[PDB]
Design an enzyme around this catalytic site. Structure first.
Site, PDB file in Angstrom:
ATOM      1  N   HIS A  62       0.838  -1.132   0.076  1.00 19.53           N
ATOM      2  CA  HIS A  62       0.084  -0.083  -0.226  1.00 19.53           C
ATOM      3  C   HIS A  62       0.904   1.279  -0.038  1.00 19.53           C
ATOM      4  O   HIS A  62       0.408   2.388  -0.401  1.00 19.53           O
ATOM      5  CB  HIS A  62      -0.869  -0.094   1.217  1.00 19.53           C
ATOM      6  CG  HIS A  62      -1.929  -0.951   1.626  1.00 19.53           C
ATOM      7  ND1 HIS A  62      -2.656  -1.284   0.524  1.00 19.53           N
ATOM      8  CD2 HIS A  62      -1.646  -2.174   2.543  1.00 19.53           C
ATOM      9  CE1 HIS A  62      -3.197  -2.430   0.830  1.00 19.53           C
ATOM     10  NE2 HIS A  62      -2.734  -3.035   2.117  1.00 19.53           N
ATOM     11  N   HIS A  92       5.772   7.020   6.315  1.00 22.53           N
ATOM     12  CA  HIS A  92       5.506   6.484   5.023  1.00 22.53           C
ATOM     13  C   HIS A  92       4.879   7.865   4.320  1.00 22.53           C
ATOM     14  O   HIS A  92       4.639   8.816   4.942  1.00 22.53           O
ATOM     15  CB  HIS A  92       4.505   5.442   4.968  1.00 22.53           C
ATOM     16  CG  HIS A  92       3.164   5.982   5.533  1.00 22.53           C
ATOM     17  ND1 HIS A  92       2.723   5.746   7.017  1.00 22.53           N
ATOM     18  CD2 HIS A  92       2.090   6.617   4.944  1.00 22.53           C
ATOM     19  CE1 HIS A  92       1.580   6.346   7.180  1.00 22.53           C
ATOM     20  NE2 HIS A  92       0.981   6.655   6.177  1.00 22.53           N
ATOM     21  N   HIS A  94       2.057   9.175   0.842  1.00 22.75           N
ATOM     22  CA  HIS A  94       0.913   8.921  -0.132  1.00 22.75           C
ATOM     23  C   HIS A  94       1.433   9.767  -1.343  1.00 22.75           C
ATOM     24  O   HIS A  94       2.056  10.973  -0.978  1.00 22.75           O
ATOM     25  CB  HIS A  94      -0.318   9.219   0.426  1.00 22.75           C
ATOM     26  CG  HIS A  94      -0.544   8.658   1.635  1.00 22.75           C
ATOM     27  ND1 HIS A  94      -1.437   7.416   1.689  1.00 22.75           N
ATOM     28  CD2 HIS A  94      -0.298   8.845   2.837  1.00 22.75           C
ATOM     29  CE1 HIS A  94      -1.321   7.047   2.944  1.00 22.75           C
ATOM     30  NE2 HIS A  94      -0.599   7.822   3.780  1.00 22.75           N
ATOM     31  N   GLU A 104      -2.973  13.762   0.658  1.00 21.43           N
ATOM     32  CA  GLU A 104      -4.390  13.179   1.320  1.00 21.43           C
ATOM     33  C   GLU A 104      -5.117  14.399   1.881  1.00 21.43           C
ATOM     34  O   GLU A 104      -6.374  14.621   1.231  1.00 21.43           O
ATOM     35  CB  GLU A 104      -4.214  12.146   2.438  1.00 21.43           C
ATOM     36  CG  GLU A 104      -3.405  11.008   1.786  1.00 21.43           C
ATOM     37  CD  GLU A 104      -3.827   9.732   2.611  1.00 21.43           C
ATOM     38  OE1 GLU A 104      -3.584   9.690   3.862  1.00 21.43           O
ATOM     39  OE2 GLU A 104      -4.260   8.804   1.948  1.00 21.43           O
ATOM     40  N   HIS A 117       3.724  10.968   6.251  1.00 21.97           N
ATOM     41  CA  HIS A 117       3.231  10.653   7.459  1.00 21.97           C
ATOM     42  C   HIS A 117       4.055  10.173   8.386  1.00 21.97           C
ATOM     43  O   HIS A 117       4.452   9.307   8.378  1.00 21.97           O
ATOM     44  CB  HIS A 117       1.859   9.902   7.295  1.00 21.97           C
ATOM     45  CG  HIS A 117       0.718  10.649   6.798  1.00 21.97           C
ATOM     46  ND1 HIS A 117      -0.271   9.866   6.166  1.00 21.97           N
ATOM     47  CD2 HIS A 117       0.660  11.841   6.580  1.00 21.97           C
ATOM     48  CE1 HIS A 117      -1.119  10.760   5.540  1.00 21.97           C
ATOM     49  NE2 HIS A 117      -0.779  11.983   5.709  1.00 21.97           N
ATOM     50  N   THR A 196      -5.962   7.027   7.940  1.00 22.73           N
ATOM     51  CA  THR A 196      -6.403   7.198   6.289  1.00 22.73           C
ATOM     52  C   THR A 196      -6.586   5.797   5.551  1.00 22.73           C
ATOM     53  O   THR A 196      -6.784   5.811   4.265  1.00 22.73           O
ATOM     54  CB  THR A 196      -5.855   8.438   5.755  1.00 22.73           C
ATOM     55  OG1 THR A 196      -4.330   7.775   5.352  1.00 22.73           O
ATOM     56  CG2 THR A 196      -5.545   9.531   6.393  1.00 22.73           C
TER      57      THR A 196
END
Ligand SMILES: N=C(N)NC(=N)NCCc1ccc(S(N)(=O)=O)cc1
Ligand SMILES: N=C(N)NC(=N)NCCc1ccc(S(N)(=O)=O)cc1
Ligand SMILES: [Zn+2]
Length: 258
Positions: A62, A92, A94, A104, A117, A196
């Site tokens: 992910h 990590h 996104h 996000e 994050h 999230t």
């Protein structure tokens, strides 16, 4: 048929297995800058990462997580809106398929190319698994990425990604200093929210820095070469691993700055 970031298993499907997806304190959110209230009672954030001990980097299917030793108070977040001490467990990102999407959180509906994050848990609950069951269990420090000049402190991360291309692959990742991922200013917005990704637990105090960091096109291109799939499986590029903004409900976003 596990959750992910496809049409048949992406964010709009998550509620079927994780009904809290439609809850009252979901993240991320759009930060409407004009309505966020300056709160003079908020304290400066205290980011104390001098003793951080990174251990490993993992492609979990992910994202990729840089994992830390959280068995002692070394890398901690304090102050700001927080009571007590939150230990760094992992960071990590996104990111998008294109530079015009990936974050996000959004700022006046602006999407950044990516979002970092830094995940921390409240030491009063003893371990991460207990902390996620509490409304004040986690503090996630969110940092926007825009594409421009390279971020020198990100390059070690970029350069290990070829070794963890596919789901389930990990590598050694010691001596990484997450101070190299911060912006100059620690001005922030804060609000109560959630994880999230599934399980979407409503356990997070979000602290989102206003100032983005700059990374180069080449750096983010390397993120987009990762795979969601496992080794030998059909290649699905790991891109667009972001959840879109969720309803604010009655929630107040507070600003640390005037
Ligand atoms: N403090 C301890 N002695 N023990 C402990 N279990 N520490 C957390 C270790 C850990 C687990 C999962 C991630 S991940 N892959 O979710 O980022 C990162 C780090
Ligand atoms: N589920 C996994 N395979 N791995 C994992 N380490 N997730 C742990 C839980 C978690 C932590 C932070 C966020 S967020 N995106 O809100 O910071 C979401 C979820
Ligand atoms: Zn995240």
């Amino acid at each position: 048929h596990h959750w992910g970031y496809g049409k048949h298993n992406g964010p709009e499907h998550w509620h079927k297995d994780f009904p809290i997806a439609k809850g009252e304190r979901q993240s991320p959110v759009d930060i409407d800058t004009h309505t966020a209230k300056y709160d003079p009672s908020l304290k400066p954030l205290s980011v104390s990462y001098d003793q951080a001990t990174s251990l490993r980097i993992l492609n979990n299917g992910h994202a990729f997580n840089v994992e830390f030793d959280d068995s002692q108070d070394k890398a901690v977040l304090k102050g700001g809106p927080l009571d007590g001490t939150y230990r760094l467990i992992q960071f990590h990102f996104h990111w998008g398929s294109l530079d015009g999407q990936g974050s996000e959180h959004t700022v006046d509906k602006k999407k950044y190319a990516a979002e970092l994050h830094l995940v921390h848990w409240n030491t009063k609950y003893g371990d991460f698994g207990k902390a996620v069951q509490q409304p004040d269990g986690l503090a996630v420090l969110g940092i926007f990425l825009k594409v421009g000049s390279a971020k020198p402190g990100l390059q070690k991360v970029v350069d290990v990604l070829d070794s963890i291309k596919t789901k389930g692959k990990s590598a050694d990742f010691t001596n990484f200093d997450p101070r190299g991922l911060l912006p100059e200013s620690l001005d922030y917005w804060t609000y109560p929210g959630s994880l999230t990704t599934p399980p979407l637990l409503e356990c997070v105090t979000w602290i989102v820095l206003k100032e983005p960091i700059s990374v180069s096109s080449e750096q983010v291109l390397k993120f987009r070469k990762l795979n969601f799939n496992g080794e030998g499986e059909p290649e699905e590029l790991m891109v667009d691993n972001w959840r879109p903004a969720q309803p604010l409900k009655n929630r107040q976003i507070k600003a640390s700055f005037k």
